[PDB]
Amino acid sequence: PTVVVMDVSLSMTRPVSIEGSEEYQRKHLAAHGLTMLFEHMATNYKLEFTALVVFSSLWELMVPFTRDYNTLQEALSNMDDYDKTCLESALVGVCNIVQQEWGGAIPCQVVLVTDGCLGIGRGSLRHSLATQNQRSESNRFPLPFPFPSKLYIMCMANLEELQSTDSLECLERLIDLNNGEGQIFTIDGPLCLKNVQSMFGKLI
Amino acid sequence: MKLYCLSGHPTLPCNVLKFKSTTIMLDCGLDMTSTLNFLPLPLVQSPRLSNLPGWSLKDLDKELKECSGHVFVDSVPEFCLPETELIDLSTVDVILISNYHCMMALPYITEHTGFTGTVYATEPTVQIGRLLMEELVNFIERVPKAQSASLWKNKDIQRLLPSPLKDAVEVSTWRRCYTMQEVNSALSKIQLVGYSQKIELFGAVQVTPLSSGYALGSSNWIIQSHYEKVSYVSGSSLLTTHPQPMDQASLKNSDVLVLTGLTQIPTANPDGMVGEFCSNLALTVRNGGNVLVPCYPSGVIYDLLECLYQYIDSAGLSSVPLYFISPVANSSLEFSQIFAEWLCHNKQSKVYLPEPPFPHAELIQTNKLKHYPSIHGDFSNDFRQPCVVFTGHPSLRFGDVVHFMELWGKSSLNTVIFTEPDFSYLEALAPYQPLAMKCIYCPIDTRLNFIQVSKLLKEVQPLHVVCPEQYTQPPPAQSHRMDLMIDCQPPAMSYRRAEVLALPFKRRYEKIEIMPELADSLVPMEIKISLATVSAVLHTKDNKHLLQPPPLLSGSIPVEQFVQTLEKHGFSDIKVEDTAKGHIVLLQEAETLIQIEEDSTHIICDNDEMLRVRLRDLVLKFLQKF
């Protein structure tokens, strides 16, 4: 009854400005994942099962059908990336897959972990998709679909790195897409990320 | 703020700390390793040393003698003193003895340098130090030898000499042994203080020793100035040892920490070493041999003989006698017995009952443990061939150990053990190299090892740590074991011999006292927090600043409320205008002018009594006393 997604983007390999909090690459930590929270969730929820499905632009598979998630995670490693960074199409496909699988009457939550990289000025066309009543031109906009769904993006980075790489700006745009239906952290800089542990504890 | 380090030895520190308006000499720490180069002093002149060959000298071979490819100085042994010439020792006022080992070479500093301050220590340290000093002086003076080799100390000859002498540092600073008269002179200046006894220096600095747990009487010192604390760490033990258990809580929240007295050869486990030593002597007795154990009369022989009697009672090999020979052997045993308060909780529980702490008194009463002041003092008549002997100095350059091991050197049946982790035993056996004697090096080191001190630091988390550069590097024996490496999140700087260090701590506020009338002078006013201001004369005596009776004004007045109050007051000729460079109003009531400008403010008040009173009342309505 849960979904875990790990980002292995090459951008995350480089540090924020000089180095990281743990003196290690952020991409490596993201690939490793939250070891403590995942271990606690796995141990407490022994009767929990999950599956991994990857589909961005074309059908592909790297982890065979197996109940154990550790085998799938191990099989996911040692793979080559593809020239594709679609966001709207990937989100639409994920929503369609979720609707086909869980239907429209099963109470469940869907969470997708994606960086959502974009640009300033040049990538201003993304605002049209986020707005449904954007004049007569966007009046017949399929996005958002007529079903209960929501997209959330969570990340933490320094202010200079966020401005340069559009990390926090992308998160703000994503939050503003849903008419600001969420909270925004006020702290910035070299502050820790203890909120993740609290969120993991509250959720389990 | 300034720390001066004089001795380059790891376990024998000699440091001077300049702390505020006082300066503290930390320890004396005689470096005994220098004596290893010299030829030993036999109690009875052996033929071997007399027929020992000299060594070639271009510039006259009697100066030096050589054995086993190692050149040795054929003169009286000399000791490497700390580099005391770096700082004028007359200036320093306090000396903080940590243990009986670290107080060695105290006569040199007290007498030669003209030091006139005071010294502090614990009673067992003073007594055991007196014992060690008198016994070593006795060893030197039993068979006097002339200072017959001095020209070898030149740097040119040292370069011409091989590595075992070239490695020596500051040979010129080496000195001959002091005399018992100087020892009596030095110990006169010492003051006795127990564990956790606050001592105030000139009303400025508080100093307190805490139980180190390494040996009875051994203590770790702290230095406090209320807002600044400096903690000094010496030889300490967390193991199940006889003295009072090591204190850990008191060292917390320490600004600067000084680390000393870590274990030499840290890999050795003392319990396994003691068991192996028991096995070695057991098999030696089984073969019919004799075991020689050079060691001090300190705590090492005490817990060694404890485990030893327990082992032989377990094995039933109690038939052989115990021989402990030293000029202060009986005194050392009785001093160990009487000092029961300084021991651990088990010993204090034992002495709550009428029984003495240690059980070797029972052996003495039943005559199963025997000791004599020397060899000639009736020990010769009572000596038996199959036995185990503890005697002499662990440096093997003097003491009865020299004669004993010369006697037993030829026979391979006999055995010699080493238990003191303070010298390289290969160097010690070098003057006696051609022997069939079986030698085993199994030192017992009860001090803190690297992992224990690392655990201590992680539990305490001091801001800064200071230690010799030897700890900062891996040992030369391994040079690859990164586990034996002191780890600290702060940089944890280090030093070498004669290296001056400046403390990073720069706290800029000390204590002061206030009497209640000044406290009542304030009338705090709510803002959000309380505010106050006072004015008192400063009185100081014996570095104790005091405040007793014989301030700025911040009258933040809002514009709108001031305008309302001025209008309500009824003063005539009120004009309000809005122009550039702020608001300017001309008032002709008393030729007053009020100007408001950014980053500036000017106040004009006449000398009229009534106008002064009205202005004072108006300010007092909205006065913040700060």
Place this chain on the structure above:
Amino acid sequence: LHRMKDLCRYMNNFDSEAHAKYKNQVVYSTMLVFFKNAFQYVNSIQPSLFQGPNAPSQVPLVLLEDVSNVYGDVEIDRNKHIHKKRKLAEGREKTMSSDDEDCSAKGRNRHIVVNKAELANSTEVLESFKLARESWELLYSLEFLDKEFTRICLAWKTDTWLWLRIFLTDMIIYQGQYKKAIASLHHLAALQGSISQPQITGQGTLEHQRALIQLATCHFALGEYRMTCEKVLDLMCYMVLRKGSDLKLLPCTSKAIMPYCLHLMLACFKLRAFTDNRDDMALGHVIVLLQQEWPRGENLFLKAVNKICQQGNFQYENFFNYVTNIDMLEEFAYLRTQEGGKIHLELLPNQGMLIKHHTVTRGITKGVKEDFRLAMERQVSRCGENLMVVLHRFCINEKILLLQTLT
């Protein structure tokens, strides 16, 4: 200042021969008093230049005028550009040594900006600077008084004697004239070189440390991109261990000397970015060197990247060598993808030269991937290295390779 303002207020309103003479005498006396006060403040604040270093004095320090307003990317003087600005700096006058002009009155609106943590007595320094500024404004309040003061300063012959030069430098520092201070520092360095001790043609040394600091401050204050680039190249090749001009206090130790090269490089990059003659290579270099200030610098770098985008025929020898910041690498990676340019590029060390030697293909792609992996491993090996070493190495390499290419 209050007494001077009151005197001037009464003097200006009154128009009489005796009143004018009294005003002139009061102005002369006030100028003398202000000069004495400035000299006393200079002697008390930092007497290091007054006597030998071993002599007792306060903590050493160096004075440099802030150039934050000039260094601003948005504040680009496109109206004048470089040629007209250089002509205005020349002023249609001879280049020979001159002083005693005081062709600026920015001290009245100038304020001392400094962090309280940098020095405990920073409040006293700011108060002294404000008092000196007020005294200078009072001296320059009247045209006749200012002319008389300038004539007196010219007649004093400050450029002749060493003590006179030091006094002139202190007065200029109090007022704001950095050029006079730089000239005095150069004269002091020349005098030190003239002594029996070894002398060099303005090389980095402990004796010439003050001259180097003054030169760096002048370069930072001015918008001279060529001079800043030349100074940065010289330092890399041979290293030695509101409105108006602002003032700040910084340490005179090696801490300020070390960041001087980085500050000079950042100023040169900002000047190049603000230059009218925009170029793809210059924009990329500026963007790589713009990771020092935000958010204006980030916006400028993004605009430069968008302008370049997919130029393709870009000349760059050690573009990746100078880049050390992760933000520049992330921006370059984003630009190389379909979002920015949709064209392949080179980011490994010396990748551009290698790429230009052969056609891009599957084998070239595999080689580039291997080179990128090796570069990533090398970066992981020494991840603790700062960007100062990378910038210095890149500057040294550029100076060794194509120093003569400039101008």
Place this chain on the structure above:
Amino acid sequence: SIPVGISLGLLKREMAQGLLPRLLHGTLIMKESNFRLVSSEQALKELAEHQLRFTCRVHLHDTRKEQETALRVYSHLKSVLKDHCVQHLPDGSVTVESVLLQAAAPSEDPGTKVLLVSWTYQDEELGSFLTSLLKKGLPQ
């Protein structure tokens, strides 16, 4: 006794003054379970710190010139104060403790001479007493 801390610079200045009559001010801020004293310059680090200073005007009526009268006043004060003043200021100003005495012209009126003097309350009481003593009688 109330335990509080003192800034090192203030204590250094106090000891220097005591070594070679002057009384020390006191400014403290209530802290979390403790109290700390801080100097005026150091208190400004709390920023805000808006400093306000009073400047009272002392009016005298005499036909004598300014500078010569100022020199006479300086001589009289240095004689009365038992040579406690061993410092001078470049613009003909003499300061005692923390009060500045300088010559300033009036605003607009030429027929009356007025000067400005600024002080704190502890200096204000002493200044008022000294001015009253001077007004009581002088060789005028």
Place this chain on the structure above:
Amino acid sequence: PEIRVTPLGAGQDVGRSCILVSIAGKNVMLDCGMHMGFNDDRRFPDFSYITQNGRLTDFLDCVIISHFHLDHCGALPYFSEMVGYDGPIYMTHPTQAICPILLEDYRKIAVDKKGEANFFTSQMIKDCMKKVVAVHLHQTVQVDDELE
């Protein structure tokens, strides 16, 4: 700022020394003496003075003994055990060694007078003294956060 002192016993006489002080709200027990000849069970102080019944450790956090003489430590056993007390007790080590046998001999002497109906016991003396904390000479032990 107030200091509260109210000694009971030996204030105007000898024996039954017991000085109760609450210097800053921290009750300190300075001595617990007795006086022979009080066959009416007046040897010990009035435990009810602190409070009628209840835990002594709630009120007291420090107990001090001068030396082994019964006029300074005679009433310690019954006060510590019978009334009920397990809080900290501080006294010198040689006093801890000399005290128990003296108390036991005195208890036996009282048994010889057949007045042992409401008197001490050997086992409770051993239990209480085993719980007593020793102190060394000049040992500036911080027994509380503010009290030493």
Place this chain on the structure above:
Amino acid sequence: SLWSNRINTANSRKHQEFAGRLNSVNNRAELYQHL
């Protein structure tokens, strides 16, 4: 005043009391009241 507030803080640091001091008039206290 600051002293007043400080003494209030010091007084606020309070704990249990004894019934005999509460009952004490003329300072002297009664021991073994039953006897």
Place this chain on the structure above:
Amino acid sequence: KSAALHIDLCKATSPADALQYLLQFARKPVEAESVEGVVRILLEHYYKENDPSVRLKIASLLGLLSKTAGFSPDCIMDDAINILQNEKSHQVLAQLLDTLLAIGTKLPENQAIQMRLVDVACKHLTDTSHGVRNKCLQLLGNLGSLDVQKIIGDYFSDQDPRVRTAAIKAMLQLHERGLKLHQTIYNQACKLLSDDYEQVRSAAQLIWVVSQLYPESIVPIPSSNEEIRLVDDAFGKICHMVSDGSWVVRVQAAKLLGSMEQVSSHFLEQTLDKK
């Protein structure tokens, strides 16, 4: 061969190796001309170097050189007082005051040099550091003979006990020189007897000195109107001072009390009985 020393010092790195080289040069002996050269080399490097510890070592070596018997230390005294005027660090200042003690002991005949030393000493006595104050008081005590007595007497009331001990030791040294003492020092030392610390009380010997100097002198009791000789009141002072708990002070008091043999026996009989 001063060239070898000069080049070796120049090649030596300033922060650390310089200290070791100077120590090694200090341990080996020196000659008169060699001293005359190395002192100027040390002064030049002292000007060049600005570290505290290095300058402290240079001052210590200057003191060691000043103790050389065969040397003629005249110009180096001038350079020493010059650097004294220029010195800032208090530890190095105290070391240079040690060198001034050395030079004063070496050459006690030149009166002009003596007054130069005492005036610069009292100038540097204004410093807040206690050590330099102690050294200056030692100079004042050593250099005397026919205002200095009143100046050091003013410093009796200093807060630091070490300075007070230095003051009383300087008084004892001055008495050893044979200068005629005053009588106001008696009450000042009487005030000092109430001091908490032990060395000050033990030194305050001074009342014994003043009692020996003027035993027949009449002194009035501050409270009682009766007149008592200096000898008898000093005897009573030592008598009730022997009750002090400092055993070294008790031994000192008894020993110096024995040296008094100019007092009436009736008072001794009165004060020795138990009632």
